[PDB]
Amino acid sequence: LEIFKSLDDWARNNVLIHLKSVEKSWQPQDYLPDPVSDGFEEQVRELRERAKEIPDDYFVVLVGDMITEEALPTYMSMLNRCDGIKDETGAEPSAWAMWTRAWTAEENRHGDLLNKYLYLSGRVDMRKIEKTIQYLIGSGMDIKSENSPYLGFIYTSFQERATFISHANTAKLAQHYGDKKLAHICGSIASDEKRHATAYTKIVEKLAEIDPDTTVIAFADMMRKKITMPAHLMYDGSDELLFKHFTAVAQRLGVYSALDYCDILEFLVDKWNVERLTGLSDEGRKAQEYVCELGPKIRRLEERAQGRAKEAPTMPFSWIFDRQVKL
Amino acid sequence: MQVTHSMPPQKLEIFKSLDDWARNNVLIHLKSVEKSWQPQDYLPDPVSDGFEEQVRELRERAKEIPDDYFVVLVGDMITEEALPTYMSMLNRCDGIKDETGAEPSAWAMWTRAWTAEENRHGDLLNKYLYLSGRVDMRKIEKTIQYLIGSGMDIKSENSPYLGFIYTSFQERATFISHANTAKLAQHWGDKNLAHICGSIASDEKRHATAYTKIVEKLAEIDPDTTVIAFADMMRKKITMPAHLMYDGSDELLFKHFTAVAQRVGVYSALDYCDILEFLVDKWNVERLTGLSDEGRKAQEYVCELGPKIRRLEERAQGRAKEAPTMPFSWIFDRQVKL
Ligand SMILES: CC(C)(C)C[C@@H](O)CC(=O)O
Ligand SMILES: CC(C)(C)C[C@@H](O)CC(=O)O
Numbered sequence: 196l197e198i199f200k201s202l203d204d205w206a207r208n209n210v211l212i213h214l215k216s217v218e219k220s221w222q223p224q225d226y227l228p229d230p231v232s233d234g235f236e237e238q239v240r241e242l243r244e245r246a247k248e249i250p251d252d253y254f255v256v257l258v259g260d261m262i263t264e265e266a267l268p269t270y271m272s273m274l275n276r277c278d279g280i281k282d283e284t285g286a287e288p289s290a291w292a293m294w295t296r297a298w299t300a301e302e303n304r305h306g307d308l309l310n311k312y313l314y315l316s317g318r319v320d321m322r323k324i325e326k327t328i329q330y331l332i333g334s335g336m337d338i339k340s341e342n343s344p345y346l347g348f349i350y351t352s353f354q355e356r357a358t359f360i361s362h363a364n365t366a367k368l369a370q371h372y373g374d375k376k377l378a379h380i381c382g383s384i385a386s387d388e389k390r391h392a393t394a395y396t397k398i399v400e401k402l403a404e405i406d407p408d409t410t411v412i413a414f415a416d417m418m419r420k421k422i423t424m425p426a427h428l429m430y431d432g433s434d435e436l437l438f439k440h441f442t443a444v445a446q447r448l449g450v451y452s453a454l455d456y457c458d459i460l461e462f463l464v465d466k467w468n469v470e471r472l473t474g475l476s477d478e479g480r481k482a483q484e485y486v487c488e489l490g491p492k493i494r495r496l497e498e499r500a501q502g503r504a505k506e507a508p509t510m511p512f513s514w515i516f517d518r519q520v521k522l
Numbered sequence: 523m524q525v526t527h528s529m530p531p532q533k534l535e536i537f538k539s540l541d542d543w544a545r546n547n548v549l550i551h552l553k554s555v556e557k558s559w560q561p562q563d564y565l566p567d568p569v570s571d572g573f574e575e576q577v578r579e580l581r582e583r584a585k586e587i588p589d590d591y592f593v594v595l596v597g598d599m600i601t602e603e604a605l606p607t608y609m610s611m612l613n614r615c616d617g618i619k620d621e622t623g624a625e626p627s628a629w630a631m632w633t634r635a636w637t638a639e640e641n642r643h644g645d646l647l648n649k650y651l652y653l654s655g656r657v658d659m660r661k662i663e664k665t666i667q668y669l670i671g672s673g674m675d676i677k678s679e680n681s682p683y684l685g686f687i688y689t690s691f692q693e694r695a696t697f698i699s700h701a702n703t704a705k706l707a708q709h710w711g712d713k714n715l716a717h718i719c720g721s722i723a724s725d726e727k728r729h730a731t732a733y734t735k736i737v738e739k740l741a742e743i744d745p746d747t748t749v750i751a752f753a754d755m756m757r758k759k760i761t762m763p764a765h766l767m768y769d770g771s772d773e774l775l776f777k778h779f780t781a782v783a784q785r786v787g788v789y790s791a792l793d794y795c796d797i798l799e800f801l802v803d804k805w806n807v808e809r810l811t812g813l814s815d816e817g818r819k820a821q822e823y824v825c826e827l828g829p830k831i832r833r834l835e836e837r838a839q840g841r842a843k844e845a846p847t848m849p850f851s852w853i854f855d856r857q858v859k860l
């Protein structure tokens with residue numbers, strides 16, 4: 196508790212440095228048709244022509260990702276549940292509160308940009324997406340970080356890397372289908388995530404230095420709970436298994452898979468020097484061995500899962516007018 | 523300086539005991555997702571054959587709406603877009619904050635559902651303003667990023683008494699504001715924009731009703747605490763949620779936006795007075811007895827304040843000069859009268 200107050204100066208010098216000043220930040224308008232341009236109408240027209248060459252399954256993944264981004268208020272609330280770092284007034288001048296608010300401000304651009312791209316595309320049912328967003332924010336999320344900044348920051352380090360990987364992959368696909376402007380959208384959001392992930396990972400690195408036992412134990416606890424996706428409760432008013440189905444599509448398309456999850460786990464183990472730690476408590480060594488260790492186990496389970504996998508299985512999605520895509 | 527957790531921890535029991543009451547009296551003011559309007563209901567339909575035509579028509583109608591009005595509408599939209607700030611406010615509130623992110627308490631259910639409803643407000647206004655071609659979206663986006671980064675300091679001190687009084691007041695304020703902007707939209711010949719504003723206003727009426735009902739109940743079971751909290755918030759003055767607004771050039775941006783909204787008749791100090799007087803009546807403040815010196819001080823203050831403010835503000839129109847014009851980045855540094 197006092198550790199985070201004692202780390203305030205450190206955070207100003209080591210965490211806040213990863214924020215881009217508002218003056219130097221990209222904005223959604225940089226990547227959208229310019230509504231004051233004499234060419235606005237043509238720019239929208241061109242966006243729509245490019246979108247016609249993008250298949251439905253990519254739009255399912257892109258919409259799921261946009262909906263996740265749009266639930267931002269949920270995520271700021273999560274960070275603000277964490278003892279030691281939470282903003283106690285809404286304007287607290289602590290390094291930690293300044294970070295939460297500025298991170299949230301950067302994140303807000305992601306949902307904005309993807310929303311308007313999707314709106315202009317004409318390839319998706321915006322009303323059904325809007326319904327899904329309302330259900331999602333109403334449902335919240337249950338990632339089990341409790342009131343722990345250890346859990347919160349470990350979870351966020353993991354999940355920002357996951358979204359970085361997802362967006363980079365989505366950019367690659369956008370470029371594949373001939374849509375450079377959508378590739379740039381995904382690339383810009385991905386660059387935010389790389390930076391955010393680096394910042395959160397740095398915080399946990401410092402915590403591991405000051406208290407290796409508490410940190411490794413929290414890492415193991417989070418991994419046992421599993422890194423639950425932020426929009427795990429998504430629902431559109433018709434598909435009670437919407438998240439499972441969206442996730443299946445995202446996997447098949449190569450945007451995000453169980454193997455990426457394993458890669459992130461092993462990345463963080465390395466970055467926090469978890470395998471190389473020594474002089475831990477009995478509980479600490481148990482946690483160390485568990486996380487070390489978990490990666491290869493999940494990778495083998497995934498390999499066996501792929502081995503026994505039967506043929507999917509096409510599914511309607513309200514987001515694309517009940518048109519069907521392969522699971 | 524900051525003050526946190528001013529509510530005595532004993533009173534946590536009150537809100538716990540009111541969970542059932544809140545399901546039956548507060549949650550009833552939410553509309554189901556299936557019955558909710560959505561932004562798409564009021565925007566050109568991107569799957570329609572006539573999408574391009576519909577966008578052209580929105581833009582043609584927008585041309586007939588003055589810059590002054592757009593300044594106020596943008597200010598309104600920027601305020602709406604800072605929604606993460608407001609959910610965090612509710613989620614730092616003793617006795618009602620969501621303990622897990624999905625807590626099945628009445629209070630957390632309300633916070634999440636209210637936030638979900640609020641999300642549509644910004645979404646709709648954002649896309650309207652984007653399509654209009656009348657405003658600088660990049661500057662608006664910069665303003666929003668500054669605002670979320672700044673947060674707000676409305677001084678409700680983690681208290682549901684202070685917080686719910688504040689939200690009762692402010693939801694009524696935004697209702698009046700949206701009702702007036704809808705009325706102006708129709709006057710400028712833009713029926714769809716009128717509907718946009720009217721739909722957001724209809725949410726605010728329900729939300730204001732719900733928050734007002736909570737404070738009414740608190741006034742019934744805890745009259746002293748509630749009236750003291752009411753006087754406390756009025757003494758500090760009801761701070762606008764976007765009071766820290768900044769666009770990277772105008773350090774007095776909030777004051778200037780407020781002056782414009784006041785001049786064009788969207789929201790003014792007399793509306794503020796009307797809300798105060800309405801809430802004094804609604805919570806039966808004058809009709810209270812059984813207080814209690816500091817509570818009697820509070821009751822006196824709150825009942826006498828409204829008359830004092832409008833003496834007074836009318837006066838100060840009166841001594842008021844002859845307003846200069848100011849550029850606003852939101853409208854490409856074009857100028858409107860303050
Ligand atoms: C880790 C969270 C809960 C902060 C969610 C985060 O991935 C959202 C985002 O960065 O888009
Ligand atoms: C009162 C607040 C802080 C909940 C803000 C609210 O007025 C914003 C809104 O309802 O649009």
Ligand SMILES: [Fe+3]
Pocket residue numbers: 264302305358
């Ligand atoms: Fe994001």
Ligand SMILES: [Fe+3]
Pocket residue numbers: 302355358387388391
């Ligand atoms: Fe992110």
Ligand SMILES: [Fe+3]
Pocket residue numbers: 602640643696
């Ligand atoms: Fe609103």
Ligand SMILES: [Fe+3]
Pocket residue numbers: 640693696725726729
């Ligand atoms: Fe509201």
Ligand code: NA
Pocket residue numbers: 264265303306307
């Ligand atoms: Na958003």
Ligand code: NA
Pocket residue numbers: 602603605641644645
């Ligand atoms: Na928004």
